[PDB]
Amino acid sequence: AGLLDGKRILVSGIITDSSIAFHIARVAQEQGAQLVLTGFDRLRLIQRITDRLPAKAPLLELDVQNEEHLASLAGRVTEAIGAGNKLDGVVHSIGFMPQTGMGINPFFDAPYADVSKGIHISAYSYASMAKALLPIMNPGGSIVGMDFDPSRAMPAYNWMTVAKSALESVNRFVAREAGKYGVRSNLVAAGPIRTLAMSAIVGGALGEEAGAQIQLLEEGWDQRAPIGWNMKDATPVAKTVCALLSDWLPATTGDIIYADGGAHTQLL
Amino acid sequence: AGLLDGKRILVSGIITDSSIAFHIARVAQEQGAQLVLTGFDRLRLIQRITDRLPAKAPLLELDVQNEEHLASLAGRVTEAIGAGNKLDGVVHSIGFMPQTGMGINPFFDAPYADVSKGIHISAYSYASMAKALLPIMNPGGSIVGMDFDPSRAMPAYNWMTVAKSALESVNRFVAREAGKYGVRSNLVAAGPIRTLAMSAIVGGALGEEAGAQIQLLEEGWDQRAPIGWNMKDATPVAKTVCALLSDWLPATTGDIIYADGGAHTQLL
Amino acid sequence: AGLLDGKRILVSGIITDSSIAFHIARVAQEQGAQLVLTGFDRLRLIQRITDRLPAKAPLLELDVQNEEHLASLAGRVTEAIGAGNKLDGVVHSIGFMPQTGMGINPFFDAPYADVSKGIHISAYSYASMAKALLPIMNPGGSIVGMDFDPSRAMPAYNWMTVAKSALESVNRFVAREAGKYGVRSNLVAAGPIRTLAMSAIVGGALGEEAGAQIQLLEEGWDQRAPIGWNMKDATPVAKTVCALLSDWLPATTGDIIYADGGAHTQLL
Amino acid sequence: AGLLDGKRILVSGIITDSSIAFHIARVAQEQGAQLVLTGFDRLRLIQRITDRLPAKAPLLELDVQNEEHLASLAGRVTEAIGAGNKLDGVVHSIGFMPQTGMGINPFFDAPYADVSKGIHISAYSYASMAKALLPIMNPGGSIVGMDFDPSRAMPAYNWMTVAKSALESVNRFVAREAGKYGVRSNLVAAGPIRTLAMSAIVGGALGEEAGAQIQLLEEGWDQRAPIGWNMKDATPVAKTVCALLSDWLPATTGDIIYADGGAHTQLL
Ligand SMILES: NC(=O)c1c[n+]([C@@H]2O[C@H](COP(=O)([O-])OP(=O)(O)OC[C@H]3O[C@@H](n4cnc5c(N)ncnc54)[C@H](O)[C@@H]3O)[C@@H](O)[C@H]2O)ccc1C(=O)c1ccncc1
Numbered sequence A, B, C, D: 001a002g003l004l005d006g007k008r009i010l011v012s013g014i015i016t017d018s019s020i021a022f023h024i025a026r027v028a029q030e031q032g033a034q035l036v037l038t039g040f041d042r043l044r045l046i047q048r049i050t051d052r053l054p055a056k057a058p059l060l061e062l063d064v065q066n067e068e069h070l071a072s073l074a075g076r077v078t079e080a081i082g083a084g085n086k087l088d089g090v091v092h093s094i095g096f097m098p099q100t101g102m103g104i105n106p107f108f109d110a111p112y113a114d115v116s117k118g119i120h121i122s123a124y125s126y127a128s129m130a131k132a133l134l135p136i137m138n139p140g141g142s143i144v145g146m147d148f149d150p151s152r153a154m155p156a157y158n159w160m161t162v163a164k165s166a167l168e169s170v171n172r173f174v175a176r177e178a179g180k181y182g183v184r185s186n187l188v189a190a191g192p193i194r195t196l197a198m199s200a201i202v203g204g205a206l207g208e209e210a211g212a213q214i215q216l217l218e219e220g221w222d223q224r225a226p227i228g229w230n231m232k233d234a235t236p237v238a239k240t241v242c243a244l245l246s247d248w249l250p251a252t253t254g255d256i257i258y259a260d261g262g263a264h265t266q267l268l
């Protein structure tokens, strides 16, 4: 009761109880929203994880790279929430980049095939999702994507960064198409969070030199952030996503809200 | 009940039922917030205007340029809301610039004295206000200033623009000091709104050539904004200010939220 | 004699006497630089075009998407300019995007395969070129790419824009690798120029609605640009590229110089 | 002979052989430019310093805050370079901020009077200078100001930063007025340089805590800069200023060129 009350959100990207979408989904349900979830290949796996959320919600399979899914999407969602009911929010907390494009291989060594598979799932996928769901969304609705500041080159994230720069730009062209439907398209740029995947790298999985850089990346975050930064609490970013699906930011589209403690506005 | 429920906000800058603070103040009271107001020289005047708000709220005199006020501020607010009660929000919907620094005189003709009086009330004043009230604010609190995109030079606003560029920067150094107290310092950049003062210029008060430029400025706003733009409805911007005093954007400080329909992210 | 005197530049992207690289190449030779050129598929074709430049220069075949070329590149260039002589400049005036990703098809209708082929030739290719040539460049050298402002969404350029946003980001990660070799990596963001390819679209080739938008795009350029803008004179942008290969901007890397008359700093 | 050959530049801001204008002036004279210099209060003092430049040049007294000077300026320059000869370049390597507004006093403690005197000499003064000299400049001319990146809040520079944010904005409105005359107005944002004034602070003059911050500021500069950074060599920035008065960047106005080694494009 409050904020997301009586809205229908479709949260994607969950794959562990650590995943930044899981935390969005929880806060959403906490605000009175009827959710719909999305999965990839380990389905039975996320089914278990999702079964832990404050309340029950469906799980539709969605491999962003798969055409059939993107075509089937619009309908599958309808049967789930009831026909004649339209979608109020779409969270795109999804992204991917192979070991090579990330920190194991240096920038110049990642082949386009990998660099491609990457930009497809993190950049382009936002657009293909906006397409497949736009028709069934309520006006005053909201589409939102998870992103990180790519304005400055930083070590270790190598290509995943470019992927995000593309993503930031795609958001702007999605802000156009959505506009006609009276839908807002935004991006929340988050600071680092120890998710299962992030933790693994800091643990020296994708190279020792990479894990050390990401180690020194987080370290510098709380240093700049005037309100500090807890890289193990996804609630703060999760609650900003809510503010962006709630009708409280009704005049902002093709934008980026920063959930990073203010680090991006500080030099040192 | 909801959002601003049980918080104490101090809204400043009201001077007519058209003023963008008046609309903030109303939406705030609408959300269950105990307000405190600020005035300048026409006091009995705004007393009448404020008496129209959803509920009763005090009115403390505050001339931002006057030292005595800035010193007296911290206490005057305390007696009003009760000693032992701390301030949860501070809205700085205030700004000024003489005819010369605005559109009547061309950029080069405005003398520093005027350019000064301007930057004092619109730029520096944010800081002097953060100082005078910071000590009595609750952690998790929020300070917010009204601003407009100065990244690109535009006609008619001449110096008032620079004033805002300074303002955008002062916000960042206020984000530092507030951080220790666990307070957030932000800026909401709004599109144009027909306030009494704005209407007057569009009516050719400050020169005919200026009024025509501001005429063609608003005209181009809805053209770019994907969700359109109503320059006679301050609610949208007013509700974004609320989102920023509500604890729903808890990891953003020294920032700028755009309440402009998305115009700033579109070229044409 | 002067500026580019006694330097070795490799200019790529020529395909007509209208092409923005052709104009770079000419101004370069005009400044006393020994050039090397690059071609794609219509070779005999550009051989004729290049034969018109102020002085003779070689022509090496380079299909940016082809591995063999990128491997063969480093050597082919060496035999040309003489072994033991190193490259002083690298111009990447190259880019591509299919009809669909441009203005014929709306944003949502362009398939990843096309969106891919696009980003490969305009974004990633800068990096693969930096790799293949970095080893043979003289310290104090310079790599430069042709780009356009993607910060704001604009009609008609649809995906080619994202391609450029990726490009702007890749430049920053190329600025790193080049740094060790003491090489600078930059981008010159140009205004519109009536090249053969541009002229064709303004002539309603890729749709009538697209040609009209690009028509109204150029129209608005000279309107904002304080020094005006001639979209049929590539010299201005061509001479900025020279300033960036000359050792006169020796402390700027991973950057973007604007050759647009100042339009990007003006709103209206 | 070359670059600045046969041009007339007016370099301001010299006050020691360490001053970043002195180095501009030298490189300028090195390029075949007839210079004109400007002084403040210690005249006989800079007369000695300037007498050391590669060749002889006049010295006109110019206190930027003084009206009489700004009125007298246009003529004094004419008698110097000969009537009927017009000015080709104007360097505004000038700025000031009291101890309090800098690092001795924290942000909130600097009084507007000081904050004023500061913004007057570093922000507004650029405009008043553009006015007083614009009438006598040759088309294709160039006005240039010394600046530093203010986008992110940083310690120690406190208000001098805001002063620069205002400065960056004033440049854009000067880019307009100059445009009609076909003059370009730009800003070169430099990294730190050990000038007499800078050295003094790093030596703990303006507080020990401030000197340590500026100590750690420079330290972090070379860390980010891909091509490194020598904070004791003003030549690199001085040669970028030349590139901007030379007619080699002819399509850039109301802009900022970065002479910082690329630090501003790198995070860590
Ligand atoms: N590290 C962080 O905590 C962080 C996360 N985000 C973004 O937030 C999103 C969520 O990431 P997370 O929760 O940390 O990790 P996650 O991997 O748990 O969740 C994302 C999903 O990728 C999904 N997957 C891959 N391909 C497909 C596909 N084809 N179809 C459907 N699903 C697929 C997968 O199923 C998983 O659910 C990503 O796009 C992140 O980049 C944004 C910012 C930060 C960040 O990465 C960062 C980096 C550098 N500086 C500052 C911050």
Ligand SMILES: NC(=O)c1c[n+]([C@@H]2O[C@H](COP(=O)([O-])OP(=O)(O)OC[C@H]3O[C@@H](n4cnc5c(N)ncnc54)[C@H](O)[C@@H]3O)[C@@H](O)[C@H]2O)ccc1C(=O)c1ccncc1
Binding pocket: B012, B013, B014, B015, B016, B018, B019, B020, B021, B039, B040, B062, B063, B064, B065, B093, B094, B095, B096, B121, B122, B146, B147, B148, B149, B157, B189, B190, B191, B192, B193, B194, B195, B196, B197, B198
């Ligand atoms: N035009 C708009 O509707 C607009 C307004 N704002 C800002 O919002 C704030 C509120 O302005 P408004 O409500 O439109 O006008 P307003 O004049 O009604 O309210 C502001 C106040 O200035 C106050 N005043 C002057 N000096 C003092 C002082 N010394 N002490 C105390 N009070 C003083 C005065 O009492 C009045 O209450 C200003 O700072 C605006 O610049 C931000 C954006 C836009 C805007 O101006 C704009 C401009 C160009 N492009 C896009 C948007």
Ligand SMILES: NC(=O)c1c[n+]([C@@H]2O[C@H](COP(=O)([O-])OP(=O)(O)OC[C@H]3O[C@@H](n4cnc5c(N)ncnc54)[C@H](O)[C@@H]3O)[C@@H](O)[C@H]2O)ccc1C(=O)c1ccncc1
Binding pocket: C012, C013, C014, C015, C016, C018, C019, C020, C021, C039, C040, C062, C063, C064, C065, C093, C094, C095, C096, C121, C122, C146, C147, C148, C149, C157, C189, C190, C191, C192, C193, C194, C195, C196, C197, C198
């Ligand atoms: N329109 C312009 O004049 C313009 C041009 N540029 C960039 O400048 C570069 C040169 O373009 P141009 O000269 O106008 O056109 P061009 O097509 O004549 O030259 C570029 C080249 O693409 C090459 N080609 C395609 N694939 C390959 C490959 N695989 N290997 C080798 N070569 C290949 C082709 O051979 C040709 O030489 C492009 O990357 C442009 O985007 C930058 C800015 C502007 C611009 O497009 C623009 C757009 C929107 N707002 C403002 C400006």
Ligand SMILES: NC(=O)c1c[n+]([C@@H]2O[C@H](COP(=O)([O-])OP(=O)(O)OC[C@H]3O[C@@H](n4cnc5c(N)ncnc54)[C@H](O)[C@@H]3O)[C@@H](O)[C@H]2O)ccc1C(=O)c1ccncc1
Binding pocket: D012, D013, D014, D015, D016, D018, D019, D020, D021, D039, D040, D062, D063, D064, D065, D093, D094, D095, D096, D121, D122, D146, D147, D148, D149, D157, D189, D190, D191, D192, D193, D194, D195, D196, D197, D198
């Ligand atoms: N520290 C640096 O080396 C540096 C210098 N600049 C700017 O370059 C300009 C030159 O400074 P500098 O040479 O280092 O020092 P400088 O003090 O030797 O020269 C500037 C002048 O101020 C002049 N002065 C004061 N008031 C007046 C007046 N009213 N009329 C005429 N002259 C007056 C004075 O006569 C002197 O000639 C300043 O505006 C700087 O801020 C730009 C960037 C950097 C920088 O400060 C910086 C800061 C933070 N991060 C990165 C870089």
